[PDB]
Design an enzyme around this catalytic site. Sequence first.
Site, PDB file in Angstrom:
ATOM      1  N   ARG A  58     -72.830 -49.805  60.137  1.00  0.00           N
ATOM      2  CA  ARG A  58     -72.680 -48.907  61.277  1.00  0.00           C
ATOM      3  C   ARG A  58     -74.017 -48.396  61.803  1.00  0.00           C
ATOM      4  NH1 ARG A  58     -67.702 -46.648  63.572  1.00  0.00           N
ATOM      5  NH2 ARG A  58     -67.608 -48.824  64.299  1.00  0.00           N
ATOM      6  N   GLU A  70     -61.721 -35.974  41.873  1.00  0.00           N
ATOM      7  CA  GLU A  70     -61.372 -36.569  43.162  1.00  0.00           C
ATOM      8  C   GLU A  70     -59.946 -37.113  43.176  1.00  0.00           C
ATOM      9  OE1 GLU A  70     -62.446 -40.447  43.967  1.00  0.00           O
ATOM     10  OE2 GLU A  70     -62.947 -40.180  46.087  1.00  0.00           O
ATOM     11  N   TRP A 109     -67.748 -35.397  49.301  1.00  0.00           N
ATOM     12  CA  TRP A 109     -67.046 -35.529  50.574  1.00  0.00           C
ATOM     13  C   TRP A 109     -67.494 -34.459  51.564  1.00  0.00           C
ATOM     14  CZ3 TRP A 109     -63.411 -39.012  52.501  1.00  0.00           C
ATOM     15  CH2 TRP A 109     -62.944 -39.977  51.601  1.00  0.00           C
ATOM     16  N   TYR A 122     -57.029 -40.166  52.162  1.00  0.00           N
ATOM     17  CA  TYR A 122     -56.217 -40.647  51.040  1.00  0.00           C
ATOM     18  C   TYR A 122     -55.068 -39.725  50.641  1.00  0.00           C
ATOM     19  CZ  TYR A 122     -59.969 -44.056  50.310  1.00  0.00           C
ATOM     20  OH  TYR A 122     -60.893 -45.063  50.468  1.00  0.00           O
ATOM     21  N   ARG A 133     -41.844 -56.633  42.755  1.00  0.00           N
ATOM     22  CA  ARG A 133     -43.081 -57.232  43.238  1.00  0.00           C
ATOM     23  C   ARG A 133     -43.543 -56.544  44.519  1.00  0.00           C
ATOM     24  NH1 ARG A 133     -41.198 -63.013  41.097  1.00  0.00           N
ATOM     25  NH2 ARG A 133     -40.198 -63.548  43.090  1.00  0.00           N
ATOM     26  N   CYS A 183     -61.962 -47.164  52.291  1.00  0.00           N
ATOM     27  CA  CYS A 183     -62.557 -48.353  51.699  1.00  0.00           C
ATOM     28  C   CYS A 183     -61.525 -48.987  50.776  1.00  0.00           C
ATOM     29  CB  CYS A 183     -63.815 -47.996  50.905  1.00  0.00           C
ATOM     30  SG  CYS A 183     -65.227 -47.482  51.910  1.00  0.00           S
ATOM     31  N   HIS A 184     -60.580 -48.166  50.329  1.00  0.00           N
ATOM     32  CA  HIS A 184     -59.506 -48.613  49.457  1.00  0.00           C
ATOM     33  C   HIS A 184     -58.219 -48.769  50.258  1.00  0.00           C
ATOM     34  CE1 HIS A 184     -62.587 -47.583  46.783  1.00  0.00           C
ATOM     35  NE2 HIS A 184     -62.195 -46.373  46.427  1.00  0.00           N
ATOM     36  N   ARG A 239     -61.748 -52.683  50.782  1.00  0.00           N
ATOM     37  CA  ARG A 239     -62.210 -53.169  52.077  1.00  0.00           C
ATOM     38  C   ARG A 239     -63.702 -53.499  52.078  1.00  0.00           C
ATOM     39  NH1 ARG A 239     -64.623 -50.579  55.917  1.00  0.00           N
ATOM     40  NH2 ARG A 239     -64.179 -48.564  54.918  1.00  0.00           N
ATOM     41  N   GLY A 286     -67.515 -52.610  49.568  1.00  0.00           N
ATOM     42  CA  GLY A 286     -68.011 -52.061  48.322  1.00  0.00           C
ATOM     43  C   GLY A 286     -69.518 -51.919  48.238  1.00  0.00           C
ATOM     44  N   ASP A 287     -69.981 -50.676  48.144  1.00  0.00           N
ATOM     45  CA  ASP A 287     -71.380 -50.406  47.855  1.00  0.00           C
ATOM     46  C   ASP A 287     -71.585 -50.673  46.371  1.00  0.00           C
ATOM     47  OD1 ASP A 287     -73.639 -47.706  48.849  1.00  0.00           O
ATOM     48  OD2 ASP A 287     -73.977 -49.468  47.586  1.00  0.00           O
ATOM     49  N   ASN A 310     -65.719 -46.337  41.960  1.00  0.00           N
ATOM     50  CA  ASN A 310     -64.436 -46.804  42.478  1.00  0.00           C
ATOM     51  C   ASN A 310     -63.564 -47.449  41.407  1.00  0.00           C
ATOM     52  OD1 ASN A 310     -66.299 -47.788  45.366  1.00  0.00           O
ATOM     53  ND2 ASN A 310     -65.059 -45.929  45.136  1.00  0.00           N
ATOM     54  N   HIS A 321     -71.341 -55.616  49.087  1.00  0.00           N
ATOM     55  CA  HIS A 321     -72.712 -55.607  49.582  1.00  0.00           C
ATOM     56  C   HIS A 321     -73.676 -54.768  48.749  1.00  0.00           C
ATOM     57  CE1 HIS A 321     -71.783 -51.631  51.187  1.00  0.00           C
ATOM     58  NE2 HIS A 321     -70.706 -52.153  51.744  1.00  0.00           N
ATOM     59  N   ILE A 322     -74.961 -55.088  48.868  1.00  0.00           N
ATOM     60  CA  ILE A 322     -76.025 -54.328  48.226  1.00  0.00           C
ATOM     61  C   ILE A 322     -77.054 -53.899  49.266  1.00  0.00           C
ATOM     62  CG2 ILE A 322     -77.921 -54.385  46.572  1.00  0.00           C
ATOM     63  CD1 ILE A 322     -76.404 -56.397  44.945  1.00  0.00           C
TER      64      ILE A 322
END
Lengths: 281, 281
Positions: B25, B62, B84, B110, B150, B170-171, B190, B192-193, B201, B231-232
């Site tokens: 972003r 959290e 947050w 959430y 299921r 992100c989740h 979605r 991940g840092d 997480n 991602h890193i």
Amino acid sequence: PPHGELQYLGQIQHILRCGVRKDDRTGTGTLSVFGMQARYSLRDEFPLLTTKRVFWKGVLEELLWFIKGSTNAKELSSKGVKIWDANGSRDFLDSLGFSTREEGDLGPVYGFQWRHFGAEYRDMESDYSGQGVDQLQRVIDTIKTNPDDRRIIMCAWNPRDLPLMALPPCHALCQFYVVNSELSCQLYQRSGDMGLGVPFNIASYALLTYMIAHITGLKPGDFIHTLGDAHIYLNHIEPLKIQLQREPRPFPKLRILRKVEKIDDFKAEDFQIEGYNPHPT
Amino acid sequence: PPHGELQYLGQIQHILRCGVRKDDRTGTGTLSVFGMQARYSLRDEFPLLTTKRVFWKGVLEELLWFIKGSTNAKELSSKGVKIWDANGSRDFLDSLGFSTREEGDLGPVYGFQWRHFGAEYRDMESDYSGQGVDQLQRVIDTIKTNPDDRRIIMCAWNPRDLPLMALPPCHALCQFYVVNSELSCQLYQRSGDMGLGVPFNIASYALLTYMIAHITGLKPGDFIHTLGDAHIYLNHIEPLKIQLQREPRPFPKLRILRKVEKIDDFKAEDFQIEGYNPHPT
């Protein structure tokens, strides 16, 4: 490079080896594993499985049916595809209590979730134009504006609408991803029939990717297939055992036969599979 | 027996190696890979990563904050967890046309979606009792009465509430799975840092599994961590490569100090991390 289908066959080996017994909703009757993931490259090849024939006409005609936003199983059956008919039956509908719905009324399934999420579902033939969320268009748009977006998600799982469907989607959501002018797609499939279901669901989302990558002027990358309840039905253990022995043929190639700019304008005669020689069943 | 943390470090090594430059972003600034999956066992151990210290107090506070149906970031900050706050900031909000909205109000995040999915969100103060699908309880209920299901899915992605919320989850969703009295859970993340948010997480949804299993009288099995955009950030590369040289200490254990009937009766003082020996930084 190794074959992409060798991942699917390997997933069967695992379920046959380390899979445990688990029943569905009817008492049957499966060998299950929770949590799998395979990557299928779409780069100059199409992951249409070759160790058994896949109903491509069913794959193609169902997706357009989804893209149309149709929710009436008769509108699909007219094209000679019957995979959804039994769920819109004039008796199975009453089995779920839906005695008011006319024959074919699946409720708010994929096509309605994709083009009109959040909307209140009336009947099959009600017009939901501009109503709800056209997340399919939101996907296409976001890719055109911000390819770096980590939010390109089309979710078909609506907890409000679950008691109104023939059955909840086996495909909860898909997420798209763009880098180096390559469009990639990951599908979260909560439940998968490795014997009958899964190969169909690989083609279906590889196709959607090919469609969107064509429209947005990108080239297809990888299709990531993530499974939750990956299971094998016990009456398929032996036919799958013999199929594992077969050697994967080279994947065919999906080619689009005309420049299409909008998505709803895609037709079944725009797609041609070439070089598809699978094994005999 | 192979150590479970090796999957996390393994993922990092792949991203450092086969990852491509992709921004987010704010113009930064990452190394991206699309589609990853790791499986963390919950059997007689808890996957609290040990190559660097994880803020367990934050992980624990959290989640109880989530179950509380909370969207007010200051309700969590009052518990000694300041993660947050900058998101519910009085400035961060103005940077999103939420200048009419009070501070701490993160929107339909959430806690709201889990307890009141499909409810018309208003603010962080009104009570939405008897509004929206209680996904969190419906999961627990279905596990108690129908473990073969299921369809045990807690989806936090609501394309209708996507405007109104600060950070879209992100989740996206988590799915539960029960076989042979073992409760397993898979999260679709979605984005991940990796070197920052991911270890936090992982521990979060393992604890949730530990909670729900305890409620449902089950023994936790596996936590499958599915990633999309993993991602890193470029400024984490060298701190992560030093972390790559560390050998993981045996995972700690999560003891539940008492017996809780309902998920809402949970409190921070019911848990006890034991055997946690992480590397410093």
